[PDB]
Design an enzyme around this catalytic site. Structure first.
Site, PDB file in Angstrom:
ATOM      1  N   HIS A 251     -15.582   1.728 -16.167  1.00  0.00           N
ATOM      2  CA  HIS A 251     -15.083   1.011 -14.614  1.00  0.00           C
ATOM      3  C   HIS A 251     -16.423   0.281 -13.972  1.00  0.00           C
ATOM      4  O   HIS A 251     -16.862   0.794 -12.789  1.00  0.00           O
ATOM      5  CB  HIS A 251     -14.468   2.422 -13.863  1.00  0.00           C
ATOM      6  CG  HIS A 251     -15.667   3.389 -13.847  1.00  0.00           C
ATOM      7  ND1 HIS A 251     -16.842   3.462 -12.849  1.00  0.00           N
ATOM      8  CD2 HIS A 251     -14.873   4.879 -14.278  1.00  0.00           C
ATOM      9  CE1 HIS A 251     -17.650   5.039 -14.052  1.00  0.00           C
ATOM     10  NE2 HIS A 251     -16.504   5.914 -14.218  1.00  0.00           N
TER      11      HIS A 251
ATOM     12  N   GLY B  30     -23.075   8.786  -9.949  1.00  0.00           N
ATOM     13  CA  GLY B  30     -24.050   7.795 -11.244  1.00  0.00           C
ATOM     14  C   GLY B  30     -24.374   8.853 -12.667  1.00  0.00           C
ATOM     15  O   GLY B  30     -24.410   8.396 -13.324  1.00  0.00           O
TER      16      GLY B  30
ATOM     17  N   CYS C  62     -21.336   9.218 -14.205  1.00  0.00           N
ATOM     18  CA  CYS C  62     -20.404   8.345 -15.216  1.00  0.00           C
ATOM     19  C   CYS C  62     -21.413   8.671 -15.806  1.00  0.00           C
ATOM     20  O   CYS C  62     -22.145   8.210 -16.620  1.00  0.00           O
ATOM     21  CB  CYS C  62     -20.015   7.513 -14.558  1.00  0.00           C
ATOM     22  SG  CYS C  62     -18.951   8.045 -13.153  1.00  0.00           S
TER      23      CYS C  62
HETATM   24  C1  LIG Z   1     -19.610   7.982 -11.794  1.00  0.00           C
HETATM   25  O1  LIG Z   1     -21.141   7.801 -11.758  1.00  0.00           O
HETATM   26  C2  LIG Z   1     -18.709   8.422 -10.820  1.00  0.00           C
HETATM   27  C3  LIG Z   1     -18.747  10.364 -10.590  1.00  0.00           C
HETATM   28  C4  LIG Z   1     -18.278  10.987 -10.103  1.00  0.00           C
HETATM   29  C5  LIG Z   1     -18.344  10.596  -8.253  1.00  0.00           C
HETATM   30  C6  LIG Z   1     -19.033  12.141  -7.972  1.00  0.00           C
HETATM   31  N1  LIG Z   1     -18.690  13.050  -8.850  1.00  0.00           N
HETATM   32  C7  LIG Z   1     -18.583  12.869 -10.040  1.00  0.00           C
HETATM   33  O2  LIG Z   1     -18.215  12.389 -10.763  1.00  0.00           O
HETATM   34  N2  LIG Z   1     -17.512   8.494 -10.789  1.00  0.00           N
HETATM   35  C8  LIG Z   1     -16.771   7.683  -9.930  1.00  0.00           C
HETATM   36  O3  LIG Z   1     -17.192   7.898  -8.923  1.00  0.00           O
HETATM   37  C9  LIG Z   1     -15.477   7.789 -10.451  1.00  0.00           C
HETATM   38  C10 LIG Z   1     -15.005   5.941 -10.010  1.00  0.00           C
HETATM   39  C11 LIG Z   1     -14.118   5.752  -9.055  1.00  0.00           C
HETATM   40  O4  LIG Z   1     -12.863   5.879  -9.772  1.00  0.00           O
HETATM   41  C12 LIG Z   1     -11.797   5.390 -10.177  1.00  0.00           C
HETATM   42  C13 LIG Z   1     -11.161   4.289  -9.261  1.00  0.00           C
HETATM   43  C14 LIG Z   1     -10.921   5.822 -11.641  1.00  0.00           C
HETATM   44  C15 LIG Z   1     -12.586   4.279 -11.323  1.00  0.00           C
HETATM   45  C16 LIG Z   1     -13.621   6.416  -8.176  1.00  0.00           C
HETATM   46  N3  LIG Z   1     -14.484   7.621  -9.220  1.00  0.00           N
HETATM   47  C17 LIG Z   1     -14.869   8.943  -8.574  1.00  0.00           C
HETATM   48  O5  LIG Z   1     -15.469   9.948  -8.588  1.00  0.00           O
HETATM   49  O6  LIG Z   1     -14.520   8.813  -7.106  1.00  0.00           O
HETATM   50  C18 LIG Z   1     -13.496  10.464  -6.237  1.00  0.00           C
HETATM   51  C19 LIG Z   1     -15.111  11.002  -5.838  1.00  0.00           C
HETATM   52  C20 LIG Z   1     -15.583  12.218  -5.632  1.00  0.00           C
HETATM   53  C21 LIG Z   1     -16.340  12.483  -4.874  1.00  0.00           C
HETATM   54  C22 LIG Z   1     -17.469  11.104  -4.838  1.00  0.00           C
HETATM   55  C23 LIG Z   1     -17.276   9.992  -5.004  1.00  0.00           C
HETATM   56  C24 LIG Z   1     -16.087   9.148  -5.822  1.00  0.00           C
END
Ligand SMILES: *[C@H](O)[C@H](C[C@@H]1CCNC1=O)NC(=O)[C@@H]1C[C@@H](OC(C)(C)C)CN1C(=O)OCc1ccccc1
Ligand SMILES: *[C@H](O)[C@H](C[C@@H]1CCNC1=O)NC(=O)[C@@H]1C[C@@H](OC(C)(C)C)CN1C(=O)OCc1ccccc1
Lengths: 306, 306
Positions: free
Chosen positions: B41, B143, B145
């Site tokens: 992603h 960040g 991921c």
């Molecule tokens: C990647 O670094 C990031 C890590 C998350 C952000 C907050 N806590 C985490 O573990 N991952 C994301 O931002 C992912 C990517 C998107 O997911 C897809 C649509 C499936 C590609 C959205 N997302 C996510 O975790 O969304 C929920 C979220 C919760 C809290 C804060 C931000 C996002």
């Protein structure tokens, strides 16, 4: 989100860890530049360990009595001296993996990461707090002596702890890297025991803020309390007094959550007097006191190290 | 003695971590030999992230769209492909710090260490368990991921987890290093949620043995129970069924403590029906289920890694 007991990445310390053997005692040493640091009770036999004159014990030693193993490479010892309760073995080779480092002594209430080691080989890493009684609730077996505790600040490793011994309650005692014991403990055989502990109040408040940041709000209230009235409750439940400096240190967390420090004190008061009534906070049924305000800001914000 | 949530030394994984930037997305990559692995992603924009055709998204990319930073050294990307939900960026340089490694997929109930990373820089290390619902209760911010989970077996790093996303309850979902998600989660925007969890019964029993090894005995009894009768209680309290293989796995711990597995089940039954009555076990007021029998034997015996 989420909140975990989080240690620092251990790589920089792993590259310093060596095996020190003298007589039949094997333990760990910390190799920085051309010095290996280790607990001085390595020079002791099981009958030495009964009322030692360490200066007499050390003058009877030779460089060659100290076998220092860095991985599968032997380090020639070329000098030896004591600094308080640690031994400094000078070796003919500076550690090419020496990180930027400092020897710092921490305060009860502060946390650090421990790299548990056996035979000079890292086994595990975990987070500890210096208890108010200068013990640490560690995880240490025979052979773990010389394992170090540390913090990392950008690229610099601040070593604060060297492991020496386990007390009869199963908690652990050691020194700073200058060889000065934390607390009223000695590296000779006595019936020494931890002595009474208290709960680290400012850390519990920090952890309550961590909880709020992470969505746990059930313990919040509109009540407030005064600092003095809170400190009367703290005393009653064997909690450390809360100072105005603690309140100031909790400012950023108070600001981020919008919960006044003294309001969170009121909440802690109710939790102390009422318990939790079957609920949990950050996955715990107990009030946790081994996260500092720094630790909470580190994890509920996200700083890294290079 | 002592018992701590203990992660593996992280040094071997720290040397693999890099920063991957594409467009305005920055996340972590895992650099092993001449391949950098990262969540696919990364190729998505905030409006891509709504029902992506990743194959279409990837064919529109170029090698030069991927900025890979290993410390303060840029890695030239010379190829790119997808494997399921991970991206494989071929770089012109093999990682000289590549440890011996394997890609393994773990089972719910198993534990691993997580090296939380931001901008390719390790931030912290902690222990996680794969929940029965294929989520992990991690600590992850934006960040993070591409941070990986792993175990170490002698000198070999078994990577089992790559972080992708946080679910609405604040728990975390990701893939194995082949890019196959743990559990029924997808890397596209939906209202996906964890779904119901259970307690890992065999791990609680292991932790009760850890407690006994460490001197906590108040929950012991001379009562025993049958496997079937215990499993009826397990069901009632949302605990996983205990199998004969679990009983067998608990043999060594049973033997070390002299407490028959089924006796410890009786004790767990009473703890489930009665609570703890104000007491703690290994410093916890809750029954802990994120230590495997292996973890307990590792820590209550003392194995290391080279
Ligand atoms: C990647 O670094 C990031 C890590 C998350 C952000 C907050 N806590 C985490 O573990 N991952 C994301 O931002 C992912 C990517 C998107 O997911 C897809 C649509 C499936 C590609 C959205 N997302 C996510 O975790 O969304 C929920 C979220 C919760 C809290 C804060 C931000 C996002
Ligand atoms: C050094 O590797 C070792 C580490 C302890 C063993 C068990 N848990 C530990 O943390 N330390 C010792 O064995 C020290 C040395 C002796 O202490 C002096 C007399 C002050 C020199 C004895 N000792 C110790 O920890 O004794 C208590 C103990 C408890 C449990 C098991 C063995 C020893």
């Amino acid at each position: 989100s989420g909140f975990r007991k989080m240690a620092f990445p251990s790589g920089k310390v792993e590259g310093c860890m060596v095996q020190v053997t003298c007589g039949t005692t094997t333990l760990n040493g910390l190799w920085l530049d051309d010095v290996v640091y280790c607990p001085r009770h390595v020079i002791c036999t099981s009958e030495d360990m009964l009322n030692p004159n360490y200066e007499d014990l050390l003058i009877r030693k030779s460089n060659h009595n100290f076998l220092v193993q860095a991985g599968n490479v032997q380090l020639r010892v070329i000098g030896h001296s004591m600094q308080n309760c640690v031994l400094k073995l000078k070796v003919d080779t500076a550690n090419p993996k020496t990180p930027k480092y400092k020897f710092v002594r921490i305060q009860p209430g502060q946390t650090f990461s421990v790299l548990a080691c056996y035979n000079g080989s890292p086994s595990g890493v975990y987070q500890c707090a210096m208890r108010p009684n200068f013990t640490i609730k560690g995880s240490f077996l025979n052979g773990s002596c010389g394992s170090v505790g540390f913090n990392i600040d950008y690229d610099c490793v601040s070593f604060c702890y060297m492991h020496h011994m386990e007390l009869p309650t199963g908690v652990h005692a050691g020194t700073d890297l200058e060889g000065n014991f934390y607390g009223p403990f000695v590296d000779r055989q006595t019936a020494q025991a931890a002595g009474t502990d208290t709960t680290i109040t400012v850390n519990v408040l920090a952890w309550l803020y961590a909880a709020v940041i992470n969505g746990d709000r059930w313990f919040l209230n509109r009540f407030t309390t005064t600092l003095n009235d809170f400190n009367l409750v703290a005393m009653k439940y064997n909690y450390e007094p809360l100072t105005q400096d603690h309140v100031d240190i909790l400012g950023p967390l108070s600001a981020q959550t919008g919960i006044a420090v003294l309001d969170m004190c009121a909440s802690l008061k109710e939790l102390l007097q009422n318990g939790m009534n079957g609920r949990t906070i950050l996955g715990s049924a107990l009030l946790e006191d081994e996260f500092t305000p720094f630790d909470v800001v580190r994890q509920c914000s996200g700083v890294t190290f290079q």
